[PDB]
């Protein structure tokens, strides 16, 4: 499907915490990698209030 191909194009979103680790030092901290994987669309469904 297009979406699962579409999302595959977006790829990661990277941000750095910036913790020095205590090795000036070129260490940028932990690397967060944010990317989606696959997308699905549920058919229209009616849950009744809460309680699933």
């Amino acid at each position: 499907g297009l979406l699962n191909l579409g999302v595959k194009d977006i790829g990661e979103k990277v941000i750095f915490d910036g913790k020095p680790l205590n090795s000036n030092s070129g260490y940028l901290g932990n690397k967060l990698s944010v990317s989606v994987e696959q997308v699905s669309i549920a058919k229209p469904m009616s849950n009744d209030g809460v309680s699933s």
Binding site: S40, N47, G49, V50, S51, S52
Partner: protein, 303 residues
């Protein structure tokens, strides 16, 4: 003499679990010391890991190494002596029976009455006999009586549906008069699959993580209603409304739907199809020893 299928009780048992886990915490606290409330019970019970198709276990190989004596007499009684006293305070507020209960569980004795055994009373002792006669009649293949039992049971305002395999086999050997088997199964599934603590699960449960009973039982048994054939694209369309989609075993149910549809380029796409879900069910789970058997079958198909 069998597990009861109603929510255990109100009574004492809470204050007993109080005493128990409170004292537990005082001893384990002073124990890490020397090694250097519903909520107290909650944190306490909390910080702890909570040729055939075997869900193989996790065996010993990268696990751990050996310990050597921690606990002489004179040194255990060290860790024991203080928390037992702090216990002497709220022990002063619980009841005599539970004073003695805590006393004995703390000496390391073990009770020989059960929570069922001691929860006395006209009504519950009657339910106890009702459910016994249920389990007995079902052992006896006396499906008729059995059924009567089950019906008077669930009629009672106390029983939660923890006795479903009760019907799922009972109504199953009762072709006779009642919508049945799959009726119950997919009913259970449809009702208890959404939002719409103790006293729980493996064979009952709610959403967000998996749900043995109703799910897998209707989810194969309908594929057995297709061994009734020699339906499928229905079972795989509404199987094909995931997600929990980590239900790897249901991935194998899906691949099974495709091997049964496969039994011209249509049949190709069905065998391509099963080839896909078998490995997307290498997700993990762990089935089918050699998939090369499934695949030797798929080559008998490839003919």
């Amino acid at each position: 003499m069998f597990e009861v299928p109603i929510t255990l009780t109100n009574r004492k048992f809470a204050q007993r679990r109080k005493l128990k886990y409170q004292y537990i915490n005082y001893i384990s606290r002073r124990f890490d010391r020397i090694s250097k409330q519903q909520k107290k019970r909650r944190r306490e019970r909390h910080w702890r890991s909570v040729s055939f198709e075997i869900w193989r276990t996790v065996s010993s190989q990268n696990k751990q190494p050996i310990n050597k004596q921690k606990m002489t007499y004179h040194n255990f009684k060290k860790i024991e002596k203080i928390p037992l006293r702090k216990m002497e305070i709220p022990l002063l507020h619980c009841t005599k029976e539970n004073k003695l209960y805590f006393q004995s569980i703390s000496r390391g004795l073990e009770p020989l009455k059960t929570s069922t055994s001691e929860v006395r009373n006209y009504r519950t002792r009657h339910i106890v006999t009702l459910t016994d006669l249920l389990h007995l009649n079902v052992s006896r293949h006396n499906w008729s009586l059995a059924y009567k039992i089950f019906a008077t049971l669930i009629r009672i305002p106390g029983v939660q549906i923890k006795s479903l395999w009760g019907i799922g086999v009972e109504i199953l050997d009762n072709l006779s008069n009642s919508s049945s088997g799959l009726d119950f199964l997919q009913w259970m599934c449809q009702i208890y699959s959404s939002k719409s603590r103790s006293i729980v699960p493996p064979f009952q449960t709610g959403s967000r993580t998996h749900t043995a009973k109703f799910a897998i039982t209707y989810l194969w048994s309908s594929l057995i209603n297709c061994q009734k054939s020699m339906l499928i694209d229905k079972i795989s369309e509404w199987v094909l409304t995931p997600p929990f989609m980590e239900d790897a075993e249901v991935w194998f149910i899906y691949a099974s739907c495709h091997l049964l549809k496969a039994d011209i380029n249509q049949v190709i796409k069905h065998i391509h199809y099963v080839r896909t879900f078998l490995k997307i069910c290498l997700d993990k789970g762990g089935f089918a020893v050699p998939s090369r058997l499934i695949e030797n079958q798929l080559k008998s198909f490839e003919s």
